[PDB]
Amino acid sequence: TYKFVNMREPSMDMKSVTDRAAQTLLWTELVRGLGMTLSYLFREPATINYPFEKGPLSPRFRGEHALRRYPSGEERCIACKLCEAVCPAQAITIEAEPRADGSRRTTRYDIDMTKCIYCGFCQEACPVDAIVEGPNFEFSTETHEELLYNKEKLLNNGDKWEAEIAANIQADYLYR
């Protein structure tokens, strides 16, 4: 099924030629273009008053990363290195070691936020929902080094955006 987009032949009767001539001299399609720009002038602009009116997002939004912890308080990451193994840009570096108490966690968990592609593959691979991408997207910085997060900064994010990340996965865990 195809349609011929431009195969219209104008009529040669005395009426049609005059209308085309009237269109030519008395610019009409130009007025129609003008007339519609006036229509948009009186309409309702769609601009949102940033930062007083932030844009609409979804619970699945991928932003700044953070390591969450169990309700008890102990971290969720058990250093399985799934997130590091599946990271498409190799932005994850992990070093683990037996903790003093037994059950062992990472001693180094660095995310290179200038090498990250924010694909979210880390939060899917994680079998304990430890590493997640938080809702924040306003962590722009003045220096390149401030982007290169390590375990401490990421753990701080987990203790800062927990009130929001907990609700997001609460609304989205059933889909996954």
Partner: protein, 238 residues
Amino acid sequence: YIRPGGVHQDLPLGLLDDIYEFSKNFSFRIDELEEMLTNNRIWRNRTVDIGVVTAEDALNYGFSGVMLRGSGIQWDLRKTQPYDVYDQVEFDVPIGSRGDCYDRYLCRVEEMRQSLRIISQCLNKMPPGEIKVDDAKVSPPKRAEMKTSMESLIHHFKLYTEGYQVPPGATYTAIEAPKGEFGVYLVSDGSSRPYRCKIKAPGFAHLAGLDKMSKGHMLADVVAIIGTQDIVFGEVDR
């Protein structure tokens, strides 16, 4: 989102309603765009009879997508070689006549309108079921099962660390991309990584022909004959 074996996760509840709401008024917005340019004397003079290519010239130069459609060649992978469920949706391909910039721009606008019918059919015929192939060795298991059963955990572990080994072979698939015939010549070797992923660029052959279409036209028309080219510069350069 689109991944081998289906999609990542199902649609959030209430998304189809918003898609219907947006598509309802998009016909008007298309008329808003095309009314100020299609009949506009300035617009046609800036595009009509500019960048005209022939039929056999377009075929030989590797042109695909709109460029064949815009110059009489009735070709569209969505109809000739239907992939996915494109054999069930009905739509009209806007074959062009003159082949210049103006005809192709009209084909683009008509292809915009035709997608709405395809959107309408997809919204009204969306079936129930899963969103990934029910096979853990290719698509990762559900998170509920990964925390419950042995096999799901092992498959999730191996799939996100090593991946799914694919049979050793070479293939060349192509789809009617919104610019052309985007395709990949994927060569495997039986491992969990590709051996060679050549990426067919619809704009590569398109940009290769820019010299042919620019022959004789004034320099100020060079922007017009790359505008109808639709060369996104992450595909040609890859």
